[PDB]
Design a protein around this ligand. Structure first.
Ligand SMILES: N#CCC(=O)N1CCC(Cc2ccccc2)CC1
Ligand SMILES: [Cl-]
Ligand SMILES: [Cl-]
Ligand SMILES: [Cl-]
Ligand SMILES: [Cl-]
Ligand SMILES: [Cl-]
Length: 343
């Protein structure tokens, strides 16, 4: 057990191992209770997150367990990883607080982009390499957007802030909805991992143009912008929409054909236009997969099929389990004390 020390940072007690020095808050509350520190063991600048109210409800205790399980699994260059997890508690009986540690990441895709074709090739390659890994473990991100992509001075990228979202959060003229696949925005059907590829298309279009692709003022305005570009649905997709009311609403709209993407993305690399056509497909069954997109000619400069790794299998059977607060808290304690740090 390391030696812990205490200090108060912006109205908050922090009790952390001596290896972590120079704790200074970051985000102005945007990231939660998150400090920058220097890690004397590894020499890395790190981010330390102190969870708020981790066991306050069944919902909150399960969410804490879910976050720790996902962060302990993800071991990939293009995905957030866990450098450490700790508690000052010496037993289950006195366990209350959880702290998570990762690489300090001060800039997101907006900070760098709010870009040449080469920059777009490399940034989208890295998102797709990370997603091939995530999808191979049957994990769905569900919230890819520029603020959830960390980028450094060498244009190296990591995916963070996995979907673990409020009705009010998704209402009106908001970036929280602009990157969402239509089938999840309007609850058309059971969604799967293809929702993430729609988001990658939206991000790639905005890196090429400098403009949000579907900046809707509300859910309905946003669906009109999407159908103007990709076309109204055919009979085959309408059959897959499980809500009769959602089906009836779509059939009230005047039919529109798919637009010519070379006349929308004027001057772009033809290979970029072709890849956008394969991502931004309304029927999720017909979208290009991450593994297929890595092999597209647009990424010929970067693609190496011997350096695009898959994940170990990920058991999420807990998601269907009904437990008490103290059962979720005990499972979380076991995962803190069993953590093994990376080499
Ligand atoms: N500067 C700044 C921001 C910053 O460094 N990042 C964004 C906030 C997350 C918070 C976090 C910490 C540990 C485990 C999961 C998530 C990570 C780091
Ligand atoms: Cl220490
Ligand atoms: Cl990381
Ligand atoms: Cl504690
Ligand atoms: Cl964003
Ligand atoms: Cl597992």
């Amino acid at each position: 057990r390391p030696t812990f020390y205490r200090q108060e940072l912006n109205k908050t007690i922090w009790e952390v191992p001596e290896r972590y020095q120079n704790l200074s808050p970051v985000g102005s509350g945007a990231y939660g209770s998150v400090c920058a520190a220097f890690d004397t063991k590894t020499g890395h600048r790190v981010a330390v997150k102190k969870l708020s109210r981790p066991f306050q409800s069944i919902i909150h205790a399960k969410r804490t367990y879910r976050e720790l399980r996902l962060l302990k699994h993800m071991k990939h260059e293009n995905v957030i990883g866990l450098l450490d997890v700790f508690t000052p508690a010496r037993s289950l009986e006195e366990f209350n607080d959880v702290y998570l540690v990762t690489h300090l990441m001060g800039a997101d895709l907006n900070n760098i982009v709010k870009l040449t074709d080469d920059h777009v090739q490399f940034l989208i390659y890295q998102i797709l390499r990370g997603l091939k890994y995530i999808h191979s473990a049957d994990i769905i991100h569900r919230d890819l957007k520029p603020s959830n992509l960390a980028v450094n001075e060498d244009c190296e990228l990591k995916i963070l802030d996995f979907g673990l979202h409020t009705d009010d959060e998704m209402t009106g003229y908001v970036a929280t909805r602009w990157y969402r696949a239509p089938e999840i925005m309007l609850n058309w059907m059971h969604y799967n991992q293809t929702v993430d590829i729609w988001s990658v298309g939206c991000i790639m279009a905005e890196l090429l143009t400098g403009r949000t692709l579907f900046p809707g003022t509300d859910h309905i305005d946003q669906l009109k912008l999407i159908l103007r570009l990709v076309g109204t649905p055919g009979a085959e997709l309408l059959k897959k929409i499980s809500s009769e009311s959602a089906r009836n609403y779509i059939q009230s709209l005047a039919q529109m054909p798919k637009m010519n993407f070379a006349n929308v993305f004027i001057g772009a690399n033809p290979l970029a236009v072709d890849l956008l056509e394969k991502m931004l497909v309304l029927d999720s069954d017909k979208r290009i997969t991450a593994a297929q997109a890595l092999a597209h000619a647009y990424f010929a400069q970067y693609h190496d099929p011997d350096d695009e790794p898959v994940a170990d299998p990920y058991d999420q059977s807990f998601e269907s389990r009904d437990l008490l607060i103290d059962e979720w808290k005990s499972l979380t304690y076991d995962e803190v004390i069993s953590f093994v740090p990376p080499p």
